[PDB]
Amino acid sequence: GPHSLRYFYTSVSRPGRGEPRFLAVGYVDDTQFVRFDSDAPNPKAEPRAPWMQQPWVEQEDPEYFHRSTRIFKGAAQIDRGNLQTLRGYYNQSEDGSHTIQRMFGCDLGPDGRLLRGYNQYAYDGADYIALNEDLTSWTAADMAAQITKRKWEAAGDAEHYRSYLEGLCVKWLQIYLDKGKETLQRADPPKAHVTHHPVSAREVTLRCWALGFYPADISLTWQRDGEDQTQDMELVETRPAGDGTFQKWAAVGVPPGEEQRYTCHVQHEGLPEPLTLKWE
Amino acid sequence: EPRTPKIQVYSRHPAENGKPNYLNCYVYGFHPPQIEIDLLKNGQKMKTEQSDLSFSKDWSFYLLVHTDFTPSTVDEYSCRVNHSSLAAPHMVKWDRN
Amino acid sequence: TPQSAPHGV
């Protein structure tokens, strides 16, 4: 189905506390597979999935890590530049710490071929500049971003992101997807169970738990005799278990005696048909 | 214009007082990325591992801080978070539900 | 595989 390769770059100036720190991680869908930190003593790109520590890497590209290392040092160095210029652009003082984030990558259609390219930036947490899916044109979010747009259009930088995306990005996404088949393409269904928690004489909380699933995408809902009550239910954000699987709970406070009128609804990629369940 | 972190404290698996487990503290939706996250046993700082820094579509950052623990009726676990968005550290008590 | 931007902003 729809798969994505994403890199996430964060640089943070630390006025007084030394030069900027660069961090980079790479993901395929919800699975991290590489990291880099410019504070590490002898800083290299490091595998962070098992399937990135298998011999296939050597044969596909014997220099894989040295290359990602090289790129990440460049990326780090450029952002040390950016943080000075953006200071300038926004006429900001020397003492404040500021943040530059880049997220770039590709999505695939279910055909296999490129669906969408991404290359987008934020400054101090807010939209700055982003490449349109024409892969020629930028959206600058403000007057400082306009300087950047004019610069990169005049210079024809979009072309380079286009060739990376059209060549490398899709190619490696497919490589990682095929090489990591058993972890990435093998979806784990959620294991759901309902728990009963008396929380007064007027309401006993019925909580629907969904656990050990991959990927993170999931819909948890409570229905009351066919009536979805998403507006009257408590539902946490999906959370990482710590073992590559995710967790989520939805809870409704019902009057005691009405337990069997509710039905928990679980929909998930790895489930054949949707789960429906209630108190024991 | 800081964004305040949302915090969830919970165990990798359903908690049986006595069975070794993993205690998670998931903090998300924050900005800037400078943040202090400790797991406490009876208010004392435990040795933990913190995930590689990352961020969501909206640019807010997220971290998993985790450790091995064995739940006791004798023991209290909490997650302690200081961010620029907070007047002072917030602590969230671990509850098996 | 990563990619670094040709120029700064």
Residue numbers in the entry:
A (entry chain A): 1 to 280
B (entry chain B): 1 to 97
C (entry chain C): 1 to 9
Paper text:
The MHC-I molecule plays a crucial role in antiviral immunity by presenting antigenic peptides to activate specific CD8+ T cells to clear virus-infected cells, while its downregulation can activate NK cells and trigger inflammatory responses. To explore the influence of the 5AA insertion on the structure and function of bat MHC-I, we focused on Mylu-B*67:01. Mylu-B*67:01 contains the most common 5AA insertion sequence, MQQPW, and also exhibits the D61/R67 pairing.
However, both wild-type and mutant COVID-19 P1 peptides exhibited better binding to Mylu-B*67:01 than Mylu-B*67:01ΔMQQPW. At the same time, some evidence also implied that the impact of MQQPW insertion is not entirely dependent on the salt bridge network formed by 61D/67 R. MQQPW insertion could enhance the binding of peptide P1-F and peptide P1-T to Mylu-B*67:01, but 61D and 67 R do not form salt bridges in their complex structures.
